[PDB]
Design a protein around this nucleic acid. Structure first.
Ligand SMILES: [Mg+2]
Ligand SMILES: [Mg+2]
Ligand SMILES: [Mg+2]
Ligand SMILES: [Mg+2]
Ligand SMILES: [Mg+2]
Ligand SMILES: [Mg+2]
Ligand SMILES: [Mg+2]
Ligand SMILES: [Mg+2]
Ligand SMILES: [Mg+2]
Ligand SMILES: [Mg+2]
Ligand SMILES: [Mg+2]
Ligand SMILES: [Mg+2]
Ligand SMILES: [Mg+2]
Ligand SMILES: [Mg+2]
Ligand SMILES: [Mg+2]
Ligand SMILES: [Mg+2]
Ligand SMILES: [Mg+2]
Ligand SMILES: [Mg+2]
Ligand SMILES: [Mg+2]
Lengths: 98, 136, 59, 76, 188
RNA sequence: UCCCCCGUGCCCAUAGCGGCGUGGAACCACCCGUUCCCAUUCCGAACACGGAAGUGAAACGCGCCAGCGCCGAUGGUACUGGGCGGGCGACCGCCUGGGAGAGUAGGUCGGUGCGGGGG
RNA sequence: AGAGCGCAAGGGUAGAAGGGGGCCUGACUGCGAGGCCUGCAAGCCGAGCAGGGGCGAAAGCCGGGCCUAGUGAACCGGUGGU
RNA sequence: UAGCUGGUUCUCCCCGAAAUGACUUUAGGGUCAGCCUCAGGCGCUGACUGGGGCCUGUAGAGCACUGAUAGGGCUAGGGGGCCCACCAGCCUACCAAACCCUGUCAAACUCCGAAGGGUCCCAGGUGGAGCCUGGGAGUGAGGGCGCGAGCGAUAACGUCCGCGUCCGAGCGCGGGAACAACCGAGACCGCCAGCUAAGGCCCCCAAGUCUGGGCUAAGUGGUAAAGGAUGUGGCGCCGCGAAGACAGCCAGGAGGUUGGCUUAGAAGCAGCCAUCCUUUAAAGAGUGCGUAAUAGCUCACUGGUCGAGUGGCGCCGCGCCGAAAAUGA
């Protein structure tokens, strides 16, 4: 399953591969047509505490700082076979809130 | 048989795929010229083959007719021919192996295949066996 | 690219259009005509396709 | 009999070829279904028509499982 | 057996045949060389030799290679060999079609039957040293309508059937004279 | 600089069917529970949520083997731009340039980008 | 992928175009770069723009049905508006 | 009125077609397009060619889909038999789905797939090339031939499409006896010049009764097949041979056995099967003719005679039979 993924691929640039673990929640700004990650704010495998949801909000804010630094803004999010509602929600939620 | 009504004429190019090797039996019968062999020509050779040596061994007919032979009832040009008159035929090209006997002597086969040669339109040859297969 | 003497000997009458156009690109008029051209890759290909009509020479 | 019949020619297939310059909108290739997929700067319509979205050159890219893609590399 | 071979290089393939030489090539897991035998020689040699026994090729290099024809391109339009391969052996085991001498008087022939014979040879994994001229076939208890399979073969030591363990070997079919002709002509 | 992992793109089966073995502290999945977000036309099987124990069986990652799938030269043919010849015809042959399919030897239980965690 | 994709057949397709539920009406008006096809006429595709509106968090999709058949120049007249 | 037929008058000079497509109460007529020619513009863009990229599904081949398909194995089902209704089990030189193997066929089947062609870019390419605008036509029955397909009957100077060519319009010239389109060759005119092309080089008839090496004795040549035959020549293979070969010749060619069964009668010699031993230098559980059936003649075998070769097989070339028509060959 990855229909959505392919939809965004042809869309444009600066994908946001939000692969989450059962407890972790990684996030990478991969740009296709070359395959290169930019802002890769990891979660549990980075520094943050232990609270998947609230941890997601912050790790999202982590992308914002690093991203706004490199002059990026295209919010080409990547659901990555995940329903927008819980953890993945806070991801783009916090990242776009700033 | 079974498939559907009519088929094209088509030409008979090189004696390529129309040719093989003694795949069964001891002796065999090979065509020297191209031609469509009729269902009757087959039955003619077959019956004459077994009728020669009574209670004979086993006769293998490798070829097989399936091409509808078209023909018009002595008139003119309305639509395609009804065909089927002579029945069917097989794309026999030089080198091919029509008949081949087995479990029998050499004289019976030598005569029977010779006889079954006249039953066929094409000038033919009779091959023994050799050992030409495909191995090591 | 050495010189290439090419003499016409076989009348193009009865041969396909392309071949005729070939001898035009080579500039061949009447029979038994002389024509010294370079040995360039293209010029070769044309004289080749009409080799049965003309006798090539290496000068 | 009752056979003499045939819809006239639709004249499909590859229209544009690789190494060809093109304007903006040129129907690169007409097709029956998905004998060819879109690609970089290449859109399609209902009849599965392939056409440029930008200006550049046509290029073909076979990819086995995925299929045969066609795109136009922009330049000026 | 022996056979006088030679090295090829640029001799025209077709024009070669017209002279009296049969084109061919030897090779193995490491080798590869354009060769060519003689028609008349190869003929009589390969007649008995066929593709079961080994034949060493004496190259002008004095090299005696234990080769065996891995394949032959039979020419259509009146049979005749066009090309020939030559797989060179060493010591590693190698598959190949070994002969089969069916021996015995099957019960089928007694009641008036037909000598059916499927695999007149069988491919089998085997060491180069092993060169069985043939394998005994105990065909005798075979009555009409019966058959013999590969799962019932007698295998000599150091060998295995490099085939499906169920394949057929031979059978016993009936005649087909008057009873069939008379019956079939009306029943069709 | 180098090795094992998590993500994710490239080559599009030499990367798979399979049989065996390895890995758990770290990563990953399974596992506990169903109050809250949310949900199964019925089920917390999945989708979702708050997370300790246990496991590494499942699944995935890494290696080994060629029984199947897969890739498969070399040599020689079949056919054929162009030139030419023979038959009454069905057709056949020669010079030049080109040249598969099949089959045989053989090859394969993957290679490779960038970002990130650990030594 | 040998099914399904309303109906013929073909090309296509489960990395959806196929089956289900939610909301809902782009089965819009005013346009149209540049094209395929083409003797003429006709047919066919269409980015992007404006107004305005549907679904979605959003990137975005929607100018009717996976697609190629389901049709008729002109004239003469009908009905409603401008 | 005549979309029909017939006629259409002086000369020289350049170029020079069509007999296709689309629609037509249209088919032997038209309209637009295509092909011809002028006039004015544009100037390496033309035909053809070298190199590079891309597209495609034929020849061929193949059996991975769709179908056909010969033989075997395995095997669900149907039929018959052993057997009994408590309804299974077993056989089944039977019909036979599915699966495997052996082996094949296909325009509307394709795992595979050339030569080639189409197109864009780069370069040669100055030609009665090409592009643009406008005046003017005619053409819209085409035919052979070669190649690839359909229809036909793998018939037609047949027909209908494609690629190319010639006649058309080059029934001007040479060859082919004569002959629009087969081979040569593209005629501005003149010459009592020379070389050549095809095809020819004894005479009618221009040129070698030329040279070397073979094949054929049928007038093949001077052109017809399946099939048939110690016609003649050349290459390769195997058997017998001076320890005595092939043919003919001299004798024998025997017993059980009148081989078993069978049969009005088979006795090696109407029909089916089995499928030895003795003597010997040799005679086979027996080849042909005969006979109601035996008797009798014969071969292989052995020996002697005899004395140098002999038989079979395959392949290459030329030739023979097969071969009967109408005014004169
Ligand atoms: Mg015959
Ligand atoms: Mg363990
Ligand atoms: Mg191949
Ligand atoms: Mg389908
Ligand atoms: Mg859907
Ligand atoms: Mg739908
Ligand atoms: Mg138009
Ligand atoms: Mg339409
Ligand atoms: Mg707008
Ligand atoms: Mg009117
Ligand atoms: Mg007309
Ligand atoms: Mg006109
Ligand atoms: Mg074919
Ligand atoms: Mg090209
Ligand atoms: Mg013509
Ligand atoms: Mg002309
Ligand atoms: Mg003439
Ligand atoms: Mg001459
Ligand atoms: Mg005669």
């Amino acid at each position: 399953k990855f229909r959505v993924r392919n939809r965004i691929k042809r869309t444009g640039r600066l994908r946001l591969s939000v692969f989450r673990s059962l407890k972790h929640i990684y996030a990478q700004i991969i740009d296709d047509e070359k395959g290169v990650t930019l802002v890769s704010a990891s979660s549990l495998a980075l520094k943050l505490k232990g609270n998947k949801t609230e941890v997601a909000r912050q790790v999202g804010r982590a992308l914002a700082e690093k991203a706004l630094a490199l002059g990026i803004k295209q919010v080409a999010f990547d659901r990555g076979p995940y329903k927008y509602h819980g953890r993945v929600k806070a991801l783009a939620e916090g990242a776009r809130e700033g | 048989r079974m498939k559907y009504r009519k088929q094209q004429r088509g030409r008979l190019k090189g004696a390529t795929k129309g040719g093989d090797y003694v795949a069964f039996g001891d002796f065999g019968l090979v065509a020297l010229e191209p031609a469509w062999i009729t269902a009757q020509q087959i039955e003619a050779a077959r019956v004459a083959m077994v009728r020669h040596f009574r209670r004979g061994g086993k006769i293998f007919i490798r070829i097989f007719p399936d091409k509808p032979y078209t023909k018009k009832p002595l008139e003119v040009r309305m639509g395609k021919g009804k065909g089927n008159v002579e029945g069917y035929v097989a794309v026999v090209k030089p080198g091919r192996v029509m008949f081949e006997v087995a479990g029998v002597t050499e004289e019976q086969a030598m005569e029977a295949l010779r006889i079954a040669g006249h039953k066929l339109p094409i000038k033919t040859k009779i091959v023994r066996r050799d050992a030409y297969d495909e191995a090591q | 690219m050495p010189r290439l003497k090419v003499k016409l000997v076989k009348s193009p009458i009865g041969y396909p259009k392309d071949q005729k156009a070939a001898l035009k690109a080579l500039g061949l008029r009447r029979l038994q005509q002389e024509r010294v051209l370079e040995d360039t890759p293209a010029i070769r290909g044309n004289v080749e396709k009409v080799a049965h009509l003309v006798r090539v020479e290496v000068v | 009999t009752k056979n003499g019949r045939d819809s006239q020619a639709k004249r499909l297939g590859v229209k544009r070829y690789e190494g060809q310059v093109v304007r903006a909108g040129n129907i690169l290739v007409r097709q029956r279904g998905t004998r060819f997929k879109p690609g970089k700067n290449v859109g399609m319509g209902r009849d599965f028509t392939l056409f440029a979205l930008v200006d550049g050159v046509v290029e073909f890219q076979d990819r086995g499982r995925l299929g045969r893609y066609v795109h136009v590399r922009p330049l000026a | 057996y022996r056979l006088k071979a030679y090295y090829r290089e640029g001799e025209k393939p077709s024009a070669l045949r017209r002279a009296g030489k049969l084109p061919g090539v030897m090779y193995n897991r490491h080798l590869n060389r354009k060769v060519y035998v003689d028609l008349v020689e190869f003929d009589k040699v390969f007649r008995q030799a066929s593709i079961h026994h080994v034949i060493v090729l004496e190259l002008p290099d004095g090299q005696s290679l234990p080769t065996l024809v891995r394949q032959v391109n039979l020419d259509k339009r009146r049979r005749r060999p066009e090309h020939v391969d030559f797989f060179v052996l060493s010591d590693e085991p190698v598959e190949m079609y070994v002969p089969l001498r069916f021996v015995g008087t099957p019960a089928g022939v007694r009641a008036g039957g037909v000598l059916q014979e499927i695999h007149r040879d069988i491919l089998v994994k085997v060491s180069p040293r092993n060169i069985p001229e043939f394998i005994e076939v105990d065909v005798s208890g075979l009555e009409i309508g019966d058959s013999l399979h590969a799962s019932d073969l007698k295998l000599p030591p150091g060998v295995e059937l490099a085939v499906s363990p169920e394949e057929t070997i031979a059978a016993v079919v009936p005649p087909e004279d008057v009873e069939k002709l008379a019956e079939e002509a009306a029943a069709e």
